[PDB]
Design a protein around this nucleic acid. Sequence first.
RNA 1: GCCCCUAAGCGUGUGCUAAGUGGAAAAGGAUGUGCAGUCGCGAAGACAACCAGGAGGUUGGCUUAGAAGCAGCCACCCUU
Lengths: 126, 37, 99, 23, 136, 132, 313
Amino acid sequence: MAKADKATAVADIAEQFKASTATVVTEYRGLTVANLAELRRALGDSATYTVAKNTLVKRAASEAGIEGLDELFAGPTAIAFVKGEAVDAAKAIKKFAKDNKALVIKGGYMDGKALSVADVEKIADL
Amino acid sequence: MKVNPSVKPICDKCRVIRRHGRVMVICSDPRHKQRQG
Amino acid sequence: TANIPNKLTANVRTRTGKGASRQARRDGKVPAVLYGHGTDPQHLELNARDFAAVLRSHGTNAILTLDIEGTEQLALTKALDVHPIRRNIQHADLLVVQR
Amino acid sequence: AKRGRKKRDRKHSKANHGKRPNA
Amino acid sequence: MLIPRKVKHRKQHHPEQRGIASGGTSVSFGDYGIQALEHAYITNRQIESARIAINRHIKRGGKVWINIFPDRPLTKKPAETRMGSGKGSPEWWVANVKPGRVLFELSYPDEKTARDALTRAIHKLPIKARIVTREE
Amino acid sequence: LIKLQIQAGQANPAPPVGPALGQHGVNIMEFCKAYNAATESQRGNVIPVEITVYEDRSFTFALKTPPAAKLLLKAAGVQKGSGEPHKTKVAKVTWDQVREIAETKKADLNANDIDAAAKIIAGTARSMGITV
Amino acid sequence: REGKAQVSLAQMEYMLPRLRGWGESMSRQAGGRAGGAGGGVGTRGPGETKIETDRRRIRERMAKLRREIRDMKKIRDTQRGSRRRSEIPSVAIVGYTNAGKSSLLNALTGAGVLVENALFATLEPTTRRGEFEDGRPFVLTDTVGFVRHLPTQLVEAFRSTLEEVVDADLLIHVVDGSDVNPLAQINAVRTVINEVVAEYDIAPPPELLVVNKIDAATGVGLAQLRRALPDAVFVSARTGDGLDKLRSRMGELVESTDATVDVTIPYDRGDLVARVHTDGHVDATEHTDAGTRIKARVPAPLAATLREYATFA
RNA sequence: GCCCCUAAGCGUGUGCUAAGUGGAAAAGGAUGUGCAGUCGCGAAGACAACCAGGAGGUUGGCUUAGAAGCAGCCACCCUU
Ligand SMILES: Nc1nc2c(ncn2[C@@H]2O[C@H](COP(=O)(O)OP(=O)(O)CP(=O)(O)O)[C@@H](O)[C@H]2O)c(=O)[nH]1
């Protein structure tokens, strides 16, 4: 939290990506820039790959927009913000993520109402 | 060892320390090793 | 154009002179004399730290509202006697600025 | 040098008050 | 060097090294200055050394002012001569410097370089001296 | 392993490959055969290929964007005529000219958009002092 | 300090025999002129005392300066040890006062040594990098300027120059054709050089005669008066010309210590050819990626690494 | 002056000194003390953070056979 800058980033992560249907979060460690570029190209249909300080994104989103999720902001996790898909493009974040060990998925915050363990073990199958 | 009344860093690597009640300059370059006396 | 006058409490001087001025400076108060068209030189002590802060933040030509035992008087720092070694304000000549 | 220095500096004592004969 | 074109009296009493400087105590020409903090007879050789140090540190640009002028002749009698038989001939040219006197002034765009050059000069000088600035 | 940019035309890639393959252990005749079989019709200007040394030998290739910034000098016929780039700017090929060749060479260019690739290519080329 | 001490010792050696009449006269003299309050330092200088004009003081100062000059000789020995041990070709610019020399150094290299039209502008020899055309590095050193009859008191002042001459490898002899009969200058410098050679019992090293100021010369001599010398080089440092010829003559005259080789360094070595390029003079290197044939003039230590890929031809 | 020599205080309160400084003297120099100011505070370190990426165009152009981010000169852009 750096005041002016944090406020601008709060605006960016509040009024530019929270307006989505599904909010996924991937814990990323050992991921190379090329690896994430390839994965993003694979999932170019959905998500936007936005990541910032967990405390910052918590204090921004969980208090201005989305509600009901806090534990997802205690580790190195990058948010997805599915553009228009619901679970159809979730394959690119499920199989192409679990084949690389790293990029561990979490979330499944469908229709921005309630949180779950991940919901991708069940709903991302389709 | 450069033993002079005045010891100062000669490069950005040199560090001024005070060891045994004595100002010295320690550096990765032994040429810049100094001591106050 | 103009700016808010800087507030400074300037108590009048009970005792004046060399010893009085030195003691005031030791206490940390720059002695001053406020004169001007009103034709009434007053002998004041401005808090040295606050006066110097005002001077260095708004410059020598900074208008000052001196609270002199409740009364507020506008005045500009006409002259500053500053010691060349200690660099402290030895004395201030303030000129009343009627509005 | 040392002798004169000591004889002169011993005037810097509380009893002498900064003065001594022959400095 | 700095030597007077002429002096009305070439065998003068030693300048009295007392009191702080009453004039020339602020930077009136340049942006930075060297203010003396002790009394000393700063000689023309010391002035020359200090100004050359400043000029060689600032290299190309910048302007240097030498506020003090060594116009006071300190005399010296011939070597291995007894006391008496008149006063010695003029030997050194000194400026009576007192605490608070600004000896040199410098204008140079780079503050660090200006301060380093003034530090050179101070090291050449025989007194404690600080770097003062026009901005009060 | 090593990008090892060598002439796209199979003329004589001796300076780059020789010393490079020296410590790598790859034999010159086999590598020349592999490179000749790779650059069959890919006779452009220059290709960088990643050998990807395996446990003993790989002979792998990785072509990404042979022309890259190096295409502008050979397109304008200016060659090594940019001493102080951005100062002694040469090869006045406008942006309306360089955009077509940039799109032509656009295969990977680490870019997902035409505008992004164009900006990257403009920045790369201008490093040699170009008046696009 | 070295130059000042040498000059002070020279002045005291000159003053000691003649301290009575001329000594007292110049002791009295306070005008601040040649000799009289001239000093032994430089700007301003110690004119008030000059050469101390006093037997006891002069002798004491002479002994002190002799000890000091021994110390400075040791210091210069240490300083020149690096060059002496590198065995790098040393080229000494000797010659008469004026006549470029310092200008010739600043031209053949990028140096900025003091170049003034006055006489005895250079009092300390100064060494610098130089690259022969063939690439052979060398050390070009400007020296102090000689005169027709150098005072015998300046032995210590000129000891540095004489030591540079003794080491030497080419002795670039700089003269100017814009003087009255430059052959007299040539002869004076040649006699001092021959005296040094006799003193140090060494073979006379090459002497590359070079003439400058030719641009400012009168050109009265066609080819045998203005260029009466058969193989003297003409440069005129100021207007760039002839300096390439001077460099070529330098390189030709300076015998090489390297050995020409034909080594076919493989392409799996890399370092053994990069170092050949680095310390060495590559030329006619084959572009074949297979065993090359680099005809470089490698130095002695590298010349022993041939049996790796020397081949036979 | 007041620990013993040596008369009277190993006096009282608070703090500082580590140098036997006290109990002799420029420049250089603190991980000693309070005091003040200026940045970062985001928790009396921050995006100098124990673990991760640190990329890509590209080996940016002059340079030679080598200049690969780091013989030497030019500025030093964009993408993600
Ligand atoms: N016109 C012209 N002038 C020259 C030439 N070479 C040198 N000069 C001038 O002659 C002067 C000689 O000074 P310098 O070059 O130092 O000669 P020098 O031998 O070092 C003098 P010293 O030996 O006492 O140090 C210089 O000021 C220089 O400008 C030349 O080729 N042409």
